[PDB]
Design an enzyme around this catalytic site. Structure first.
Site, PDB file in Angstrom:
ATOM      1  N   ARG B 109       0.792  -1.237   0.000  1.00  0.00           N
ATOM      2  CA  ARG B 109       0.000   0.000   0.000  1.00  0.00           C
ATOM      3  C   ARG B 109       0.821   1.282   0.000  1.00  0.00           C
ATOM      4  NH1 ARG B 109      -4.117  -0.857   4.821  1.00  0.00           N
ATOM      5  NH2 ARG B 109      -2.660  -2.529   5.429  1.00  0.00           N
ATOM      6  N   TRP B 278       1.980  -5.590  -9.039  1.00  0.00           N
ATOM      7  CA  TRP B 278       3.083  -6.447  -9.450  1.00  0.00           C
ATOM      8  C   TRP B 278       3.350  -7.431  -8.308  1.00  0.00           C
ATOM      9  CZ3 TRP B 278       4.149  -0.972  -9.261  1.00  0.00           C
ATOM     10  CH2 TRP B 278       4.804  -0.544  -8.101  1.00  0.00           C
ATOM     11  N   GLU B 283       4.891 -14.795  -3.274  1.00  0.00           N
ATOM     12  CA  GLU B 283       3.600 -15.374  -3.704  1.00  0.00           C
ATOM     13  C   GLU B 283       3.855 -16.497  -4.694  1.00  0.00           C
ATOM     14  OE1 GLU B 283       0.507 -12.189  -4.600  1.00  0.00           O
ATOM     15  OE2 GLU B 283       2.347 -10.992  -4.718  1.00  0.00           O
TER      16      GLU B 283
HETATM   17  C1  HEM Z   1       1.736  -2.618  -6.849  1.00  0.00           C
HETATM   18  C2  HEM Z   1       2.265  -3.678  -6.227  1.00  0.00           C
HETATM   19  C3  HEM Z   1       1.469  -4.536  -5.209  1.00  0.00           C
HETATM   20  C4  HEM Z   1       2.012  -5.439  -4.374  1.00  0.00           C
HETATM   21  C5  HEM Z   1       3.504  -5.774  -4.255  1.00  0.00           C
HETATM   22  C6  HEM Z   1       0.963  -6.030  -3.570  1.00  0.00           C
HETATM   23  C7  HEM Z   1       1.087  -7.006  -2.600  1.00  0.00           C
HETATM   24  C8  HEM Z   1       0.086  -7.787  -2.051  1.00  0.00           C
HETATM   25  C9  HEM Z   1       0.215  -9.127  -1.496  1.00  0.00           C
HETATM   26  C10 HEM Z   1       1.526  -9.930  -1.448  1.00  0.00           C
HETATM   27  C11 HEM Z   1      -0.985  -9.524  -1.046  1.00  0.00           C
HETATM   28  C12 HEM Z   1      -1.377 -10.867  -0.396  1.00  0.00           C
HETATM   29  C13 HEM Z   1      -1.777 -11.807  -1.531  1.00  0.00           C
HETATM   30  C14 HEM Z   1      -2.055 -13.213  -1.052  1.00  0.00           C
HETATM   31  O1  HEM Z   1      -1.330 -13.717  -0.152  1.00  0.00           O
HETATM   32  O2  HEM Z   1      -2.991 -13.858  -1.598  1.00  0.00           O
HETATM   33  C15 HEM Z   1      -1.915  -8.449  -1.300  1.00  0.00           C
HETATM   34  C16 HEM Z   1      -3.249  -8.468  -0.986  1.00  0.00           C
HETATM   35  C17 HEM Z   1      -4.196  -7.589  -1.442  1.00  0.00           C
HETATM   36  N1  HEM Z   1      -3.936  -6.542  -2.316  1.00  0.00           N
HETATM   37 FE1  HEM Z   1      -1.993  -5.861  -2.884  1.00  0.00          FE
HETATM   38  N2  HEM Z   1      -0.228  -5.455  -3.976  1.00  0.00           N
HETATM   39  C18 HEM Z   1       0.033  -4.538  -4.971  1.00  0.00           C
HETATM   40  C19 HEM Z   1      -0.947  -3.802  -5.628  1.00  0.00           C
HETATM   41  C20 HEM Z   1      -2.301  -3.792  -5.343  1.00  0.00           C
HETATM   42  C21 HEM Z   1      -3.330  -3.035  -6.039  1.00  0.00           C
HETATM   43  C22 HEM Z   1      -3.023  -2.160  -7.267  1.00  0.00           C
HETATM   44  C23 HEM Z   1      -4.502  -3.289  -5.435  1.00  0.00           C
HETATM   45  C24 HEM Z   1      -5.906  -2.739  -5.757  1.00  0.00           C
HETATM   46  C25 HEM Z   1      -6.084  -1.542  -6.329  1.00  0.00           C
HETATM   47  C26 HEM Z   1      -4.239  -4.214  -4.329  1.00  0.00           C
HETATM   48  C27 HEM Z   1      -5.159  -4.723  -3.433  1.00  0.00           C
HETATM   49  C28 HEM Z   1      -5.082  -5.825  -2.601  1.00  0.00           C
HETATM   50  C29 HEM Z   1      -6.190  -6.421  -1.869  1.00  0.00           C
HETATM   51  C30 HEM Z   1      -7.670  -5.985  -1.856  1.00  0.00           C
HETATM   52  C31 HEM Z   1      -5.590  -7.598  -1.099  1.00  0.00           C
HETATM   53  C32 HEM Z   1      -6.320  -8.595  -0.178  1.00  0.00           C
HETATM   54  C33 HEM Z   1      -6.098  -9.989  -0.775  1.00  0.00           C
HETATM   55  C34 HEM Z   1      -7.323 -10.837  -0.599  1.00  0.00           C
HETATM   56  O3  HEM Z   1      -8.108 -10.540   0.338  1.00  0.00           O
HETATM   57  O4  HEM Z   1      -7.508 -11.808  -1.376  1.00  0.00           O
HETATM   58  N3  HEM Z   1      -2.902  -4.470  -4.314  1.00  0.00           N
HETATM   59  N4  HEM Z   1      -1.236  -7.415  -1.907  1.00  0.00           N
HETATM   60  C1  LIG Z   2      -8.073 -19.474  -2.140  1.00  0.00           C
HETATM   61  C2  LIG Z   2      -8.291 -18.094  -1.531  1.00  0.00           C
HETATM   62  C3  LIG Z   2      -7.225 -17.189  -1.568  1.00  0.00           C
HETATM   63  C4  LIG Z   2      -7.393 -15.915  -1.022  1.00  0.00           C
HETATM   64  C5  LIG Z   2      -6.273 -14.891  -1.040  1.00  0.00           C
HETATM   65  C6  LIG Z   2      -6.054 -14.394  -2.474  1.00  0.00           C
HETATM   66  N1  LIG Z   2      -5.305 -13.114  -2.548  1.00  0.00           N
HETATM   67  C7  LIG Z   2      -5.069 -12.840  -3.965  1.00  0.00           C
HETATM   68  C8  LIG Z   2      -4.437 -11.501  -4.255  1.00  0.00           C
HETATM   69  C9  LIG Z   2      -5.160 -10.305  -4.181  1.00  0.00           C
HETATM   70  C10 LIG Z   2      -4.558  -9.083  -4.485  1.00  0.00           C
HETATM   71  C11 LIG Z   2      -3.205  -9.066  -4.859  1.00  0.00           C
HETATM   72  C12 LIG Z   2      -2.556  -7.874  -5.175  1.00  0.00           C
HETATM   73  C13 LIG Z   2      -1.214  -7.893  -5.556  1.00  0.00           C
HETATM   74  C14 LIG Z   2      -0.540  -9.111  -5.595  1.00  0.00           C
HETATM   75  N2  LIG Z   2       0.766  -9.176  -5.940  1.00  0.00           N
HETATM   76  N3  LIG Z   2      -1.189 -10.247  -5.291  1.00  0.00           N
HETATM   77  C15 LIG Z   2      -2.493 -10.253  -4.931  1.00  0.00           C
HETATM   78  C16 LIG Z   2      -3.106 -11.469  -4.633  1.00  0.00           C
HETATM   79  C17 LIG Z   2      -8.621 -15.570  -0.450  1.00  0.00           C
HETATM   80  C18 LIG Z   2      -9.676 -16.472  -0.414  1.00  0.00           C
HETATM   81  C19 LIG Z   2      -9.483 -17.766  -0.974  1.00  0.00           C
HETATM   82  C20 LIG Z   2     -10.421 -18.644  -0.996  1.00  0.00           C
HETATM   83  N4  LIG Z   2     -11.319 -19.380  -0.964  1.00  0.00           N
HETATM   84 CL   LIG Z   3      -0.904 -15.525  -7.492  1.00  0.00          CL
END
Ligand code: HEM
Ligand SMILES: Cc1cc(CCNCc2ccc3ccc(N)nc3c2)ccc1C#N
Ligand SMILES: [Cl-]
Ligand code: HEM
Ligand SMILES: Cc1cc(CCNCc2ccc3ccc(N)nc3c2)ccc1C#N
Ligand SMILES: C[C@H](O)[C@H](O)[C@H]1CNc2nc(N)[nH]c(=O)c2N1
Ligand SMILES: C[C@H](O)[C@H](O)[C@H]1CNc2nc(N)[nH]c(=O)c2N1
Ligand SMILES: [Cl-]
Ligand SMILES: [Gd]
Ligand SMILES: [Gd]
Ligand SMILES: [Zn+2]
Lengths: 401, 402
Positions: B109, B278, B283
Site C-alpha cells: 500500500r 506487481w 507469492e
Molecule cells: C503494486 C504492487 C502490489 C504489491 C507488491 C501487492 C502485494 C500484495 C500481497 C503480497 C498480497 C497478499 C496476496 C495473497 O497472499 O494472496 C496483497 C493483498 C491484497 N492486495 Fe496488494 N499489492 C500490490 C498492488 C495492489 C493493487 C493495485 C490493489 C488494488 C487496487 C491491491 C489490493 C489488494 C487487496 C484488496 C488484497 C487482499 C487480498 C485478498 O483478500 O484476497 N494491491 N497485496
Molecule cells: C483461495 C483463496 C485465496 C485468497 C487470497 C487471495 N489473494 C489474492 C491476491 C489479491 C490481491 C493481490 C494484489 C497484488 C498481488 N501481488 N497479489 C495479490 C493477490 C482468499 C480467499 C481464498 C479462498 N477461498
Molecule cells: Cl498468485
C-alpha cells in the site's frame, strides 16, 4: 460455534470449547487486536467451584460425593480464612490444564507429561533457591530434558508475594555501553542493572549467566549465583562451515520461564517457574537474529560471503537457515533435547486433533504457533485457529519492581 | 484508543482511525477469529454516501465548501428520485484508490496513490468487457515495467444482472484433474478450468496453460474469450547458480490481476472491477510453487539439490524454498519484469504505516497476511503490532456466480 477450516486438506471442525471461555480477550467486532503481545469471597468462590467441578469431571467422578465433600470443604475453608488450599492432586491437575490451555504454546502435545514440584511449604529466599536448584537439576537431566514446574506459596491478603525477578532461570547479561550499545543480551539490560544494583559484580562476556534475584514475602530480593555445574550450555558450531565455531556463539539447555503467574481455581501463584525444552527457531531465529537481540545475521552472512547490499539475494534468509542448522546440529551433537520447527508443528497438528476429540476444540494463537521462519512450509500455517482464555491459566504479571 | 507497539524499536502509537470502523468483523471479547480466511435501504445508502463524499472533499481539502454541500444535496436528491446515484469520475478515481488504501491484507500500500483508473461504466456487452480487459492488461504489463491499474465496470443496479468475471485472476494456469485424484497444472484453478471446458474451451495438457476468460454481461450466460498470446507476458524460471533448475521447465506470468473481488464505494457496489499491481516474489516462490496443495515442488528441488530429505532437522525444506525464491527473483530481474522481494516490500510497508499514522491516525492491517510466508521475523513487520478493521471504500470477497 466457530467453523474452523484447514486449507491444505479442506477439512472442517467446530470449536465448541470456546463457548466456555473464562475471561475476555482484547478483540471486539469493530477491531481485531489479536496481534498484541499483551491483551472478594464470592468471586473467589465462583472460580473455586468451577475448578473443582472441572477436576472431578476429568476423573469421571462428577455427581459423586467425594465431589460434594470437596465442594463444601472449600466453601468452609474460604469462609474461615479468606483463601483455601489445593489438594496436591488438584495442584498437579491445575498445572497441567494451565499448560494445556496456553494458546501460544506449540509444545502442547506434551501437556499430560509434566513433573510438578510442590514448594508451597517454602518460607525463605534460601529455600526458594534450593527448590530452584533441584528443579534445574531434575529438568536438565544431563541433556535428556524433562518438563517440570515448581510451585511456590500462593499470594494471600496482608502478605507480600514470592517472586522471581528474573524472566528466566537462565539469562545472559546485557551490559549497556556508554555508546548506547549492548554487550550481551539487550533483552536483559534491565535485570543486569538490578543484579548489579543488588551487589552483583558484573562480567564482561557476550554470554555471562546472570545471578538469580529471589524475593521472599515482604522482604527485599537477594542475589544467588547458580552453581555453573548446574547450568548446561551448548557451544554452537556448524556441521560444514568450520569458521562458525569461532563466532563464539552459545546458548543454554533449559528454557525455564520464571516470571509468569499461575492461576488455579481463583488462586494465584506469582512464582511458579516452569520449563520444557527448546524449539530451535527460538534460539536460532529469534534470540540470535532479532534486530533487538543478538542481531548476528549480517555477521554470519558476511562470513558466508553473501552479497549483503541487495535484499533480492536473500542473504538474510540463507544465513538465518544456516544459523538454525547450527543450533540443531550443536544440540544434537551435545545430546541435548531440542525440536525443529517442522517436527514441532506436525506434533501440534496431532495435538489439535486429540483436543478436538478430547474437549471439542483447542485455544490457539496463530501468530505464535506459526514459526518465525518458513511459516507456510509448516502445516499450522494452513490451519485456521480460534484464540480464547480458559482457566487454569498462565498469565503475564506486572514487574515486582 | 488501542495502544500499539513496535517491539524492534520500542516505539508506541495509538490507532484512533479504528474507531471509524463501521462494519463488523468476526471477533468478540470472548474469542478471536483473526485467522479465518473469510472474516465474513435508502437511509443507510445515504449515510454511506454522505460519508464517502465527506471523505472526498476532505482529501482535496475543500471540506464545508459550497461545492461539498452542493454535491451532498445532489446525491441526496438522486437517491430520493432513483433509489441510487452515480459517482462523478473524480470520486470513482479516489474511491478506487481508497479501497486499495483500506485493504488490511495488502503489504503493497505504499503505492496506493499511484493507481491508474480505467472507467468502463458505459460497458454494455461481454465482447466490450474483453476489449476493456485487453487494454487493461496492455497498460499494466507495459512490456515488463508494471503499472498498477483498475478497470471499473458498471455498478450493481435493480432489475438488471451484474457484470462478472468468473476467473479469479485475468491470468491463471489450467488445472486438469487427473482421475488419479491428482492434478496437472495449477490445483487452485480446477473449478474454473472445468467450467471453461464445460463452456466450450478446447483444453490443453500442459502444466502452464493460460486459461481463457469467462466474461459475464448482465442476464446473459458467461461468454468464453481467448487471451491473445502476445498479451500474456510470462517469465521462464531459472536459477542463477543452479543450472539444472531450468530443466524443471517452470514459469510464471508477470501480471497479478485479481478479477473476482467486489469494489464498494459510498454504498455503490461494483461486482466487476479487476485490478493489478506487481508480484511479491514469495507469492510465486513460496506459496504458488511450494504449497503442498499447489505445484508442490519442494521435495523435487531438495532432491535435485542433494539434501537429506529423510529428516526434518536437516532443514532441507527451508533450504529448497529459499533457493526457489532466489530463482523467481533472478528470473524476473533477468526478464526485466517488475517484482519485489519480501524484505523490500515489508520495509516499504513500515514506511506506509508511518505515513498513515500521520495522515489518518492509524492503518488497518492484518498481521497474519502482512508477514511473509518465509522469514517472517527477519522482516520488520513481524515486530509491529497491528490493528485489523474494516474501512470503506473497500475491496470485498463475493460469492462465485455459479
Ligand atoms: C503494486 C504492487 C502490489 C504489491 C507488491 C501487492 C502485494 C500484495 C500481497 C503480497 C498480497 C497478499 C496476496 C495473497 O497472499 O494472496 C496483497 C493483498 C491484497 N492486495 Fe496488494 N499489492 C500490490 C498492488 C495492489 C493493487 C493495485 C490493489 C488494488 C487496487 C491491491 C489490493 C489488494 C487487496 C484488496 C488484497 C487482499 C487480498 C485478498 O483478500 O484476497 N494491491 N497485496
Ligand atoms: C483461495 C483463496 C485465496 C485468497 C487470497 C487471495 N489473494 C489474492 C491476491 C489479491 C490481491 C493481490 C494484489 C497484488 C498481488 N501481488 N497479489 C495479490 C493477490 C482468499 C480467499 C481464498 C479462498 N477461498
Ligand atoms: Cl498468485
Ligand atoms: C516441552 C516442550 C515445549 C516446547 C517445545 C514449547 C514450545 C514453545 C514455544 C516455541 C513457545 C513460543 C514462546 C516464544 O515465542 O517466546 C511457547 C510458549 C509458551 N509455552 Fe510452551 N513449550 C514447551 C513446554 C511448555 C511447558 C512445560 C509449559 C508450562 C507448564 C509451557 C507453557 C507455555 C506458555 C504459557 C507459552 C506462552 C508464551 C508467553 O506468553 O511468553 N510450555 N512454547
Ligand atoms: C519480552 C516478552 C516476551 C514475551 C514472550 C516470551 N515467551 C517466552 C517463553 C515462555 C514459555 C516457553 C515455554 C517453552 C519454550 N520452549 N519456550 C518458552 C518461551 C512476552 C512478553 C514480553 C514482554 N514484555
Ligand atoms: C508484533 C507481534 O505481535 C509480536 O512480535 C509477536 C508475533 N508472534 C510471536 N510469536 C512467537 N512465538 N513469539 C513472539 O515473540 C511473537 N511476537
Ligand atoms: C489459516 C491462515 O490464516 C491462512 O492460511 C492465511 C494466513 N495468512 C496469509 N497471508 C497471506 N498474505 N496470504 C495467505 O494466503 C495467507 N493465508
Ligand atoms: Cl528463549
Ligand atoms: Gd574468506
Ligand atoms: Gd552451478
Ligand atoms: Zn481478533
Amino acid at each position: 460455534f466457530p467453523r474452523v477450516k484447514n486449507w491444505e486438506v479442506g477439512s472442517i471442525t467446530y470449536d465448541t470449547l470456546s463457548a466456555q471461555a473464562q475471561q475476555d480477550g482484547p478483540c471486539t467486532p469493530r477491531r481485531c487486536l489479536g496481534s498484541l503481545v499483551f491483551p472478594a469471597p464470592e468471586q473467589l468462590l465462583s472460580q473455586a467451584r468451577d475448578f473443582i467441578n472441572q477436576y472431578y469431571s476429568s476423573i469421571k467422578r462428577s455427581g459423586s460425593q467425594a465431589h460434594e465433600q470437596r465442594l463444601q470443604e472449600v466453601e468452609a475453608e474460604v469462609a474461615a480464612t479468606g483463601t483455601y488450599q489445593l489438594r496436591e492432586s488438584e495442584l498437579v491437575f491445575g498445572a497441567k490444564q494451565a499448560w494445556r490451555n496456553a494458546p501460544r504454546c506449540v509444545g502442547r502435545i506434551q501437556w499430560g507429561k509434566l513433573q510438578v514440584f510442590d514448594a508451597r511449604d517454602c518460607r525463605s529466599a534460601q529455600e526458594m533457591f534450593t527448590y530452584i536448584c533441584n528443579h534445574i537439576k531434575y529438568a536438565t537431566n544431563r541433556g535428556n530434558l524433562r518438563s517440570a514446574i515448581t510451585v511456590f506459596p500462593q499470594r494471600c491478603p496482608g502478605r507480600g508475594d514470592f517472586r522471581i525477578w528474573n524472566s528466566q532461570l537462565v539469562r545472559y547479561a546485557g551490559y549497556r555501553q556508554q555508546d548506547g550499545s549492548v554487550r550481551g543480551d539487550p533483552a536483559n539490560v534491565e535485570i543486569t542493572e538490578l543484579c548489579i544494583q543488588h551487589g552483583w559484580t558484573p562480567g564482561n562476556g557476550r554470554f555471562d549467566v546472570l545471578p538469580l534475584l529471589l524475593q521472599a514475602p515482604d522482604e527485599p530480593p537477594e542475589l544467588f549465583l547458580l552453581p555453573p555445574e548446574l547450568v548446561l550450555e551448548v557451544p554452537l558450531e556448524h556441521p560444514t562451515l568450520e569458521w562458525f565455531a569461532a563466532l563464539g556463539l552459545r546458548w543454554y539447555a533449559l528454557p525455564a520461564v520464571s516470571n509468569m503467574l499461575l492461576e488455579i481455581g481463583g488462586l494465584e501463584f506469582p512464582a511458579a517457574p516452569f520449563s520444557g525444552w527448546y524449539m530451535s527457531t527460538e534460539i536460532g531465529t529469534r534470540n540470535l537474529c532479532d534486530p533487538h537481540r543478538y542481531n548476528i545475521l549480517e555477521d554470519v552472512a558476511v562470513c558466508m560471503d553473501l552479497d549483503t547490499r541487495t535484499t533480492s539475494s536473500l542473504w538474510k534468509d540463507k544465513a538465518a537457515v544456516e544459523i538454525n542448522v547450527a543450533v540443531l546440529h550443536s544440540y544434537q551433537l551435545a545430546k541435548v533435547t531440542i525440536v525443529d520447527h517442522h517436527a514441532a508443528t506436525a506434533s501440534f497438528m496431532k495435538h489439535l486433533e486429540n483436543e478436538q476429540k478430547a474437549r471439542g476444540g483447542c485455544p490457539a494463537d496463530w501468530a505464535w504457533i506459526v514459526p518465525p521462519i518458513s511459516g507456510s512450509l509448516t502445516p499450522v500455517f494452513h490451519q485456521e485457529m480460534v484464540n480464547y482464555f480458559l482457566s487454569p491459566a498462565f498469565r503475564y504479571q506486572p514487574d515486582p519492581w
